[PDB]
Design a protein around this ligand. Structure first.
Ligand SMILES: O=c1ccn([C@@H]2O[C@H](COP(=O)(O)OP(=O)(O)O)[C@@H](O)[C@H]2O)c(=O)[nH]1
Length: 380
DNA sequence: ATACTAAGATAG
């Protein structure tokens, strides 16, 4: 047994790094370990309430509570750092952050996970080079990437088993006329391809489309400037949502993760159209990818992403397996629509497919396999 | 152009 301190020096953004952090805590605890979740409250974000953490996470203001922070990160056997201060923070914050790195007990094994898989990243990171100099172990999403002592690979795991046994519904309860897209307002999440698809196929067939997570950040202005039809709702107005036929895309903003899993488990189809560049592509799928195969719905993933990510077991393209995963192709959206109405009539098939994906995604990124993988390297 | 990005003010 050991004490682990998970540190998010950037703050709790409420996305994959926060998620990863929560799933990381769950696993250590599940394997009999003490975990303290600490985050720097200097900077504030929006999706702060998207994941449940308030009752156990420990905030700290680096620019003003250095000693509190020092006491915190030095009270453990293993320090895992998942994020670092952003470029928009004050000198005192980044500076005091760097001062923490220099005063971490020589005995504490410092493990650093580089969660950003974009060249654009690392630029929005401060004190990154000092974190790397003190790290005892480093993990990244890809070897053939921008980032590149010894850098190991990892996948952001999730307890897919748990999610199923909580939300997985009975086919007879899944409305085949609802298409749900989840992600956020950045172009590579594929929100345009989703708006198109609805306008060209989904809407016509009196089907419905929902898109959760599109925050009205500056990026949202492009959607407006292009005059794309949509009806906007907040989490408290999710009741006014019009799930009728031939309607425009219903857009929900920053959503609660638990609630989303519920609405999804009762949805004929779930869309995750992220299209990341193969440089930073190896084996890592994204949380929203694994949340679809787990809640019990047919997963529509971006075709070229599957063609670029390797399966954890054999190291081969994900698209070269019978996952029951519908690979969305921007250059053949009608064929993709085929495999959809198809499974949307023979609910018997739909259910023999959603079972195939869950097993596939389970074998690929469940915490049971991945964290054990990462734990062996940390303690190697 | 194209791809990626919560910037910033205010009410509660
Ligand atoms: O408004 C939102 C948007 C996303 N998420 C969750 O936050 C995580 C985001 O991680 P992912 O790897 O899917 O993408 P990222 O946002 O980190 O690029 C996923 O578990 C989503 O279900 C959420 O709870 N609310």
């Amino acid at each position: 047994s050991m004490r682990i301190c998970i540190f998010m020096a950037r703050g709790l953004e409420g996305c994959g790094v926060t998620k990863f952090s929560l799933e990381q805590r769950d696993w250590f605890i599940k394997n009999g370990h003490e975990v303290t979740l600490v985050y720097a409250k200097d900077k504030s974000f929006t999706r702060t309430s998207s994941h449940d953490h308030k009752s156990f996470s420990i905030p700290v203001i680096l620019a003003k509570e250095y000693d509190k922070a020092l006491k915190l990160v030095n009270d453990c056997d293993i320090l895992i750092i998942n994020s670092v201060p952003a470029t928009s923070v004050q000198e005192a914050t980044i500076n005091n952050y760097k001062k923490l790195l220099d005063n971490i007990k020589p005995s504490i094994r410092v493990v650093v996970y580089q969660h950003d898989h974009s060249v654009l990243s690392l630029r929005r990171n401060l004190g990154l080079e000092e974190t790397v100099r003190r790290a005892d172990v480093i993990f990244s999403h890809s070897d053939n990437g921008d980032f590149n002592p010894t850098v190991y690979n990892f996948q952001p795991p999730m307890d897919i088993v748990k999610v199923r046994s909580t939300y997985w519904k009975d086919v007879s309860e899944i409305n085949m006329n609802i298409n749900r897209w989840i992600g956020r307002t950045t172009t590579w999440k594929g929100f345009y391809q989703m708006f198109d698809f609805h306008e060209k196929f989904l809407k016509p067939a009196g089907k419905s489309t929902v898109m959760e997570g599109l925050e009205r950040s500056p990026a949202f202005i492009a959607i407006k400037e292009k005059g794309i039809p949509y009806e906007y709702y907040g989490n408290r107005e999710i009741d006014k949502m019009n799930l009728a036929p031939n309607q425009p895309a219903q857009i929900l903003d920053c959503y609660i993760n638990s609630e989303m899993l519920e609405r999804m488990s009762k949805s004929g189809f779930g869309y995750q159209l992220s299209k990341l560049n193969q440089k930073y592509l190896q084996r890592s799928l994204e949380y929203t990818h694994l949340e679809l195969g787990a809640c019990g719905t047919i997963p529509v993933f971006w075709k070229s992403t599957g063609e670029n990510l390797k399966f954890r077991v054999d190291n081969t393209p994900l698209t070269s397996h019978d996952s029951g995963i519908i690979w969305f192709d921007e250059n053949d959206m009608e064929s993709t629509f085929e495999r959809i109405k198809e499974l949307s009539s023979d609910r018997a098939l739909y259910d023999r497919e959603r079972e195939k994906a869950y097993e596939f995604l389970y074998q690929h990124q469940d915490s049971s396999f991945c964290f054990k993988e990462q734990f062996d390297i940390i303690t190697k």
